[PDB]
Design a protein around this ligand. Structure first.
Ligand SMILES: C=CC[C@]1(C(=O)O)C[C@H](O)[C@@H](NC(C)=O)[C@H]([C@H](O)[C@H](O)CO)O1
Length: 679
């Protein structure tokens, strides 16, 4: 077998289920005997077949259907390989879900992939569109030379007992087969020739997080576009993990983004890039003793130009599912204060409070203690800052070891090793900025209003809303949801963010995940669209600036799942078809988070008054990709030009098979012309 390229073919159209024989190529005899090597190919799939082999080499004869090697893709964007010679001899597999796409802006696009079988390092590596997707190490390295009775080299399928299995349909732009193992750098470069959309946050940036989730995108009145997202360090798991909130901005209409910052973060556990295991056991493991921030909301007060960032604040080892019932506050002298437990007191004895100027009081004696906290909630004993050892986390087999290091960090009331510990329920935190993120104010815990009967009261991620007209013009609103007397709720402010008031929008006690977003009607009334625990998105209306809301009404015509997914709905500044318009984003499948679509709803005045004054006609729907392609949480924003920006999760964030994937948060832009099917 010679060194270098054994075979190359260009522009090969393959009819679905037909395949294409490469048996008469000059180098087929070498390819059928490869001991190692590299395969790189450019393709465009036009088929909806479940599994589609791009390239294969194997034994096509009777009873030898498990003797072959193939690189394949799935209609849901997965990519992988199978190296087989019957299960008793060997069956090596490697794959990564949501690695390729099928359609972009209405047309089928090319993806570039590569497999590297490195004999010297006894390792296999998969690449696609400029990214290293997965790695497989084997002590008993095997390749094509190890398959018994190889008799074919095929494009677009795998020959099994004389039939074309895993049928591809489309075009193989180019394929190059090398007997040598090219470097990872060469493959990143080669496959990086085809990319779609862009990343704002990514594995390797200064956040030091390998994973991101829960997008927020907002264009400011100044033209600057800002964004935020969960920087999920310990895999893509929800809280009871180590998560910080990342932030970035664009001053050129969303073309390039700044170096990300971490406006909301904890230091009890180190922030580091770590590859979370994706095996059936390790994938379920999550960080146990870390405090975190989760689910961001961005909002601008157009009058003052001030911006706000809200997020849920989870004490050490807490998440919504295990938060304790209670407000986390205690009323003394008619004023609500954050309550604390001295580490040497009884397990449930919260006998202290943080009062004026952060001074901690002994509630029993009503006398100040020798401790206090600053605007960051870090402890001080007699003006000396307290510290504790930062933790690190590493896997030893399937076990996650969380151990103290030698690094000292400031002791915070939300940390597990703090001398004074906060009540283990969730909180609502916020910071404001008057310089578009160059600096943020002190930590403001606004959840003193948390109902004492509630398990959790959290935010509906995305953006908030400021009323632009009517009697309540100027009012700031942020959507909330809880497990208490009400499910859907809101917090509003009439003094530009200085103080907030909580509102219960219903009397549902089930605690379903009612994540919602708010839109304003022409007269200042409001309509809120929300995820529900039923098979539909609900709509509620308010005629009094969000103080009271109508009963939930199903949003007719827009399909969803029973468990549901967060949605994004925004106001658009110009009329569409001459009418006021709102734009909605959400996966459209009835099972699985996939088939994302952007809808345009036109506001019509029915001629009635009150809650029934307006009716929204969802006139247009725009499919982002093919039906099986993953699409989860998202956030829309009207960019300074006429475009609509979209920051979304391009994978199924609910699936137990798609956890811990890197670089799935993508940013794309669409014109109203495109969105209205008008090309
Ligand atoms: C595993 C994903 C949970 C999540 C969701 O995607 O449904 C994401 C979101 O971040 C999360 N929020 C909090 C505060 O935990 C919720 C939540 O975990 C429940 O799943 C409610 O849907 O939904």
């Amino acid at each position: 077998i010679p060194e270098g390229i054994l075979m190359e073919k260009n522009n090969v159209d393959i009819a679905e289920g037909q395949g294409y024989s490469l048996d008469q190529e000059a180098g087929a005899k070498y390819v059928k005997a490869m001991t190692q090597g590299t395969i790189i190919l450019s393709y465009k799939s036009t088929s909806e077949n479940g599994i589609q082999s791009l390239f294969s080499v194997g034994n096509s004869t009777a009873g030898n259907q498990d003797r072959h090697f193939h690189i394949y893709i799935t209609n849901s964007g997965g990519i992988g390989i199978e190296l087989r010679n019957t299960d008793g001899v060997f069956n090596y597999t490697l794959d990564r879900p949501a690695s390729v796409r099928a359609l972009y802006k209405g047309e089928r696009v090319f993806n570039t992939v590569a497999l590297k079988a490195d004999a010297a390092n006894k390792q296999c590596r998969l690449f696609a569109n400029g990214e290293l997707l997965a790695t497989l190490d084997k002590d008993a390295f095997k390749f094509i030379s190890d398959i018994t009775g190889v008799d074919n080299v095929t494009l677009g399928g795998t020959k099994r007992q004389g039939k074309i299995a895993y049928p591809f349909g489309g075009t193989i732009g180019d394929i190059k087969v090398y007997s040598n193992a090219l470097s990872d750098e060469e493959l990143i470069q080669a496959t990086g020739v085809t990319t779609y959309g862009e990343n704002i946050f990514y594995a390797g940036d200064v956040t030091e997080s390998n994973y991101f989730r829960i997008p927020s995108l907002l264009t400011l009145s100044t033209g600057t576009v800002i964004s935020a997202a969960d920087a999920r360090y310990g895999g893509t798991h929800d809280s009871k993990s180590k998560i910080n909130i990342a932030f970035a901005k664009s001053t050129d209409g969303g073309n390039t983004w700044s170096e990300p910052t971490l406006p909301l973060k904890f230091d009890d556990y180190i922030a580091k890039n770590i590859d979370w295991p994706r095996d059936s056991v390790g994938k379920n493991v999550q960080i146990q003793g870390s405090a975190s921030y989760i689910d961001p909301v961005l909002l601008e007060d157009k009058l003052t130009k001030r911006i706000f960032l809200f997020a849920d604040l989870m004490p050490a080892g807490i998440g919504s599912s295990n938060a304790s019932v209670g407000s986390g506050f205690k009323e003394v002298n008619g004023k609500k204060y954050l309550k604390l437990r001295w580490h040497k007191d009884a397990g449930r004895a919260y006998d202290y409070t943080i009062r004026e100027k952060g001074v901690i009081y002994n509630d029993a004696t009503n006398q100040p203690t020798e401790f206090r906290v600053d605007g960051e909630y870090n402890l001080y004993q007699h003006d000396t800052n307290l510290t504790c050892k930062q933790y690190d986390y590493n896997f030893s087999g399937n076990n996650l070891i969380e151990s103290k290091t030698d690094v000292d960090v400031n002791m915070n009331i939300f940390y597990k090793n703090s001398v004074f510990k906060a009540f283990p329920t969730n909180y609502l935190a916020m910071r404001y900025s008057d310089d578009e993120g160059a600096s943020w104010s002190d930590l403001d815990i606004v959840s003193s209003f948390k109902p004492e009967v509630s398990k959790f009261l959290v935010v509906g991620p995305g953006i908030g809303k400021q009323i632009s007209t009517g009697e309540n013009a100027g009012r700031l609103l942020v959507p909330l949801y809880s497990k208490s007397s009400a499910e859907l709720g809101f917090m509003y402010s009439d003094d530009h963010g200085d103080n907030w008031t909580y509102v219960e929008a219903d009397n549902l006690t089930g605690g379903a995940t009612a994540e919602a977003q708010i839109v304003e009607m022409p007269d200042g009334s409001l309509k809120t669209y929300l995820r529900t625990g039923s098979n539909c998105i609900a709509e509620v209306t308010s005629i009094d600036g969000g103080e009271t809301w109508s009963d939930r009404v199903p949003l007719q015509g827009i399909s969803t799942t029973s468990y549901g997914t967060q949605l994004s709905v925004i106001n658009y500044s110009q009329p569409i078809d001459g009418k006021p318009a709102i734009i909605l984003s959400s996966p459209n499948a009835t099972n699985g988070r996939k088939n994302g679509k952007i809808w345009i709803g036109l506001v019509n005045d029915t001629g009635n008054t009150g809650i029934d004054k307006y009716s929204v006609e969802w006139k247009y729907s725009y499919a982002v990709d093919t039906p099986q392609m993953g699409y989860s949480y998202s956030c829309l924003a009207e960019l300074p030009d006429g475009q609509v920006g979209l920051l979304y999760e391009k994978y199924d964030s609910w699936s137990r098979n798609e956890l811990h994937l890197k670089d799935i948060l993508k940013f794309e832009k669409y014109s109203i012309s495109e969105l209205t099917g008008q090309a």
